[PDB]
Design an enzyme around this catalytic site. Structure first.
Site, PDB file in Angstrom:
ATOM      1  N   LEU A 135      15.077 -21.965 -25.498  1.00  0.00           N
ATOM      2  CA  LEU A 135      15.320 -21.023 -26.739  1.00  0.00           C
ATOM      3  C   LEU A 135      14.402 -21.258 -27.984  1.00  0.00           C
ATOM      4  O   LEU A 135      14.687 -20.552 -28.748  1.00  0.00           O
ATOM      5  CB  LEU A 135      16.776 -20.695 -26.790  1.00  0.00           C
ATOM      6  CG  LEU A 135      17.423 -20.262 -25.680  1.00  0.00           C
ATOM      7  CD1 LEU A 135      18.971 -20.427 -25.796  1.00  0.00           C
ATOM      8  CD2 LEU A 135      17.062 -18.815 -25.305  1.00  0.00           C
ATOM      9  N   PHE A 189      15.779 -30.084 -36.449  1.00  0.00           N
ATOM     10  CA  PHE A 189      16.440 -31.395 -36.369  1.00  0.00           C
ATOM     11  C   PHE A 189      16.703 -31.454 -34.680  1.00  0.00           C
ATOM     12  O   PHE A 189      17.592 -32.267 -34.378  1.00  0.00           O
ATOM     13  CB  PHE A 189      17.751 -31.473 -37.090  1.00  0.00           C
ATOM     14  N   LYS A 197      21.932 -27.353 -27.972  1.00  0.00           N
ATOM     15  CA  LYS A 197      21.129 -28.188 -28.958  1.00  0.00           C
ATOM     16  C   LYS A 197      21.057 -29.509 -28.602  1.00  0.00           C
ATOM     17  O   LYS A 197      22.034 -30.252 -28.079  1.00  0.00           O
ATOM     18  CB  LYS A 197      21.601 -28.076 -30.306  1.00  0.00           C
ATOM     19  CG  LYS A 197      20.792 -28.447 -31.374  1.00  0.00           C
ATOM     20  CD  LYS A 197      21.270 -28.233 -32.805  1.00  0.00           C
ATOM     21  CE  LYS A 197      20.001 -28.495 -33.710  1.00  0.00           C
ATOM     22  NZ  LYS A 197      20.425 -28.263 -35.039  1.00  0.00           N
ATOM     23  N   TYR A 248      25.792 -18.514 -26.983  1.00  0.00           N
ATOM     24  CA  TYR A 248      24.635 -17.773 -26.519  1.00  0.00           C
ATOM     25  C   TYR A 248      24.592 -16.379 -27.285  1.00  0.00           C
ATOM     26  O   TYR A 248      25.364 -15.694 -26.843  1.00  0.00           O
ATOM     27  CB  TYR A 248      24.229 -17.791 -25.241  1.00  0.00           C
ATOM     28  CG  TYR A 248      22.875 -17.050 -24.588  1.00  0.00           C
ATOM     29  CD1 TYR A 248      21.737 -17.322 -25.390  1.00  0.00           C
ATOM     30  CD2 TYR A 248      23.063 -16.037 -23.665  1.00  0.00           C
ATOM     31  CE1 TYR A 248      20.683 -16.753 -24.974  1.00  0.00           C
ATOM     32  CE2 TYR A 248      21.874 -15.680 -23.203  1.00  0.00           C
ATOM     33  CZ  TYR A 248      20.752 -16.102 -23.881  1.00  0.00           C
ATOM     34  OH  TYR A 248      19.399 -15.358 -23.396  1.00  0.00           O
ATOM     35  N   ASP A 284      21.362 -20.794 -47.184  1.00  0.00           N
ATOM     36  CA  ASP A 284      19.772 -20.254 -46.629  1.00  0.00           C
ATOM     37  C   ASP A 284      20.264 -19.052 -45.571  1.00  0.00           C
ATOM     38  O   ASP A 284      20.017 -19.240 -44.421  1.00  0.00           O
ATOM     39  CB  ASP A 284      19.025 -21.224 -45.573  1.00  0.00           C
ATOM     40  CG  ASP A 284      17.857 -20.643 -45.270  1.00  0.00           C
ATOM     41  OD1 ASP A 284      16.936 -19.912 -46.128  1.00  0.00           O
ATOM     42  OD2 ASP A 284      17.385 -20.636 -44.042  1.00  0.00           O
ATOM     43  N   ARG A 343      17.316 -13.677 -40.189  1.00  0.00           N
ATOM     44  CA  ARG A 343      16.551 -14.701 -39.155  1.00  0.00           C
ATOM     45  C   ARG A 343      17.760 -15.578 -38.668  1.00  0.00           C
ATOM     46  O   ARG A 343      17.757 -16.215 -37.647  1.00  0.00           O
ATOM     47  CB  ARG A 343      15.373 -15.565 -39.685  1.00  0.00           C
ATOM     48  CG  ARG A 343      15.497 -16.089 -41.180  1.00  0.00           C
ATOM     49  CD  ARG A 343      14.352 -17.078 -41.293  1.00  0.00           C
ATOM     50  NE  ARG A 343      14.414 -17.384 -42.931  1.00  0.00           N
ATOM     51  CZ  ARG A 343      14.130 -16.774 -43.826  1.00  0.00           C
ATOM     52  NH1 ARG A 343      13.653 -15.448 -43.658  1.00  0.00           N
ATOM     53  NH2 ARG A 343      14.234 -17.307 -44.877  1.00  0.00           N
ATOM     54  N   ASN A 344      18.561 -16.027 -39.759  1.00  0.00           N
ATOM     55  CA  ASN A 344      19.557 -16.928 -39.389  1.00  0.00           C
ATOM     56  C   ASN A 344      20.740 -16.355 -39.142  1.00  0.00           C
ATOM     57  O   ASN A 344      22.103 -16.836 -39.364  1.00  0.00           O
ATOM     58  CB  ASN A 344      19.698 -17.986 -40.717  1.00  0.00           C
ATOM     59  CG  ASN A 344      18.611 -18.583 -41.006  1.00  0.00           C
ATOM     60  OD1 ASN A 344      18.057 -19.245 -40.201  1.00  0.00           O
ATOM     61  ND2 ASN A 344      18.122 -18.632 -42.354  1.00  0.00           N
ATOM     62  N   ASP A 381      23.284 -21.762 -38.134  1.00  0.00           N
ATOM     63  CA  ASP A 381      23.004 -22.963 -38.937  1.00  0.00           C
ATOM     64  C   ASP A 381      23.728 -23.264 -40.255  1.00  0.00           C
ATOM     65  O   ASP A 381      23.145 -23.424 -41.411  1.00  0.00           O
ATOM     66  CB  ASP A 381      21.448 -22.939 -39.531  1.00  0.00           C
ATOM     67  CG  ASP A 381      20.749 -22.893 -38.146  1.00  0.00           C
ATOM     68  OD1 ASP A 381      20.996 -23.448 -37.185  1.00  0.00           O
ATOM     69  OD2 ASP A 381      19.534 -22.386 -38.156  1.00  0.00           O
TER      70      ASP A 381
END
Ligand SMILES: COc1cccc(/C(O)=C2\C=Nc3nccc(-c4cc(F)cc(F)c4)c32)c1
Length: 287
Positions: A22, A27, A52, A101, A148, A152-153, A166
């Protein structure tokens, strides 16, 4: 190579079938996978998940960061509007942090892919901003400061549920500065209120169906800009109410900005008063 097993989350390494990648975090890297018998009461069922993990050339600090990220997610606890931890493989092999997911990419991708000429009613956008604010107030309540926040996050699931991502990290891959509040930009002062500001900008992204803040405005110039008191212009067709909301978020004085509790309220109200048949128009799709 010193990980303790936490039976509350441990999952047999052989019950995880890794698949298409994906992508890769900063990190590490994340791949799509199918977890067998994750329900534990339905061990014969497969569940699409996001795993992850570290790269082959992963530094010792990276694993440090990965473990640290998993433990924070454990602390923070579950919530509909965030990406939740589902398990981990910490024994006899590389560390696998399993989370939820999101089959429809991040909010930005999701929006742009739904620009006219499926579509999104005017309500879809507001309720969309509603969920992000829930996830954000939940995290805020758990003492968590995102630092942040941006479309997009924010990931979307197969059920169109907004899930913040995140949120359990610390420390310019996608030009973040445009989402940072003044005090955070000039003095690295991150707080819940500075996250509210970023939310303002995330509202802007929503009512432009996936646009990029300060269109064309030269980053370097952005600085003095916000100091002079300038803010982005109301997005095309965006209501007066929602524009006021984003202006409040961008208040000069961080103490004078709203809170996610308030925003969640107002947005709860606004959603109940928005038509599910009012499709927006995007003749000039910026970015
Ligand atoms: C909660 O914070 C985390 C922790 C670990 C991984 C992610 C993450 O990002 C995803 C989680 N479910 C996903 N479903 C589809 C794509 C991605 C994805 C994977 C990537 F590597 C990059 C990306 F942009 C999206 C994720 C988020």
């Amino acid at each position: 190579y010193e990980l303790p097993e936490d039976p509350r989350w441990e999952l047999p390494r052989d019950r995880l079938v890794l698949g298409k990648p994906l992508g890769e975090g900063a990190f590490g890297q994340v791949v799509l996978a199918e977890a067998i018998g994750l329900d534990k009461d339905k061990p014969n069922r497969v569940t699409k998940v996001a795993v992850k993990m570290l790269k082959s050339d992963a530094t010792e600090k990276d694993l440090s960061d990965l473990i640290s990220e998993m433990e924070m997610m454990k602390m923070i606890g579950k919530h509909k509007n965030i990406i939740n931890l589902l398990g981990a493989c910490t024994q006899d092999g590389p560390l696998y942090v399993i989370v939820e997911y999101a089959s429809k990419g991040n909010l930005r991708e999701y929006l742009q892919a739904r620009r006219p000429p499926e579509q999104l009613s005017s309500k879809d956008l507001v309720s969309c901003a509603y969920q992000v604010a829930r996830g954000m107030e939940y995290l805020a309540s758990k003492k968590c400061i995102h630092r942040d926040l941006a479309a997009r996050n924010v990931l979307v699931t197969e059920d169109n549920v907004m899930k913040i991502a995140d949120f359990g990290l610390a420390r310019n891959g996608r030009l973040p500065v445009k989402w940072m509040a003044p005090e955070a930009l000039f003095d690295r002062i991150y707080t819940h209120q500075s996250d509210v500001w970023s939310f303002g900008v995330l509202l802007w992204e929503i009512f432009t169906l996936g646009g990029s803040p300060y269109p064309g405005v030269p980053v370097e110039e952005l600085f003095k800009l916000l100091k002079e008191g300038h803010r982005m212009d109301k997005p095309s067709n965006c209501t007066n109410e929602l524009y006021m909301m984003m202006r409040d978020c961008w208040h000069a004085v961080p103490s004078q900005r709203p809170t996610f509790k308030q925003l969640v309220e107002d947005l709860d109200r606004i959603v109940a008063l928005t038509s599910n048949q009012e499709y927006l128009d995007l003749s000039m799709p910026l970015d």
